[PDB]
């Protein structure tokens, strides 16, 4: 109740700031940079916005492959849809925690990878992940 | 409780695993990778060991000054007490979290900078402070160093 509207919280600001930093650069602009580099701010941008949706299927029991073939085909080719798949994302994992109870809360839930947490857990988790991932992106932001 | 003990153990995978990562490395490699930003990878996870140290002190009062002369005189020059301060840095962490009940945890705190959160909402923000600033170092490795595993 308060625990998980403060989890969504810290994550509705994590999505909400990633999505005023996307307004900021162009297509072009996040293709390029960083100049000499293995890796692209679109690519991991656009990786990003599919998180929330990701770990929620996986909270859900989504096989390996499910997830192998959704972040290969299902990735945005368009900043527009980052934004919008983040915001759905958001939209849908809220109202999924929103609808829990205690019991659900404390659910044990196993990924394919075989780590099991609480569903209360895998929120924070998301949270972890969406931060570690924006992370990564702030560093190479400074080219 | 069960929402706490869950944060806590997200922080101390990250904690562990930052340690495992830290193992993968030398001093050497640390200080002399090239980077491109004013500090050093040496210096960014030197900073990263100090995060529940730091940030607990945040949520207790502790003045911009205090912070100012901790990070001066604390922050670790080795990497074996880089593991130490991590360690006890979480360990006072979690045993303070732990001794909270439920209206502790709603408590109202603010930061030396005037935001104020409830003491759980705090602990998630340790929580994104600690694997934003492991994920800038991550992708530092990887850029600039050899790929280590989480």
Not at 1 to 7: E, H, I
Request: proline fraction near 1%; charge should be negative.
């Amino acid at each position: 109740g308060m625990f998980v509207q403060s989890a969504l919280h810290q994550l509705k600001v994590a999505v909400d700031t990633s999505i005023q930093m996307l307004d900021q650069y162009t297509e072009i602009d996040l293709k390029i940079a960083p100049i000499q580099s293995k890796r692209s701010l679109f690519e991991m941008y656009a990786h990003l916005s599919l998180i929330c949706h990701a770990d929620l299927l996986i909270l859900n029991g989504s096989t390996e492959k499910e997830l192998h073939t959704f972040y290969k085909e299902q990735t945005p080719e368009t900043i527009a849809q980052m934004q919008k798949t983040m915001i759905q994302g958001y939209d849908l994992l809220s109202k999924t925690f929103l609808s829990y109870s205690n019991e659900q809360l404390a659910e044990m839930k196993t990924a394919y990878w075989g780590i099991s947490y609480s569903r209360f857990e895998w929120l924070l988790e998301i949270v972890a992940h969406f931060y570690h991932h924006r992370g990564q992106i702030h560093i190479l932001l400074c080219e």
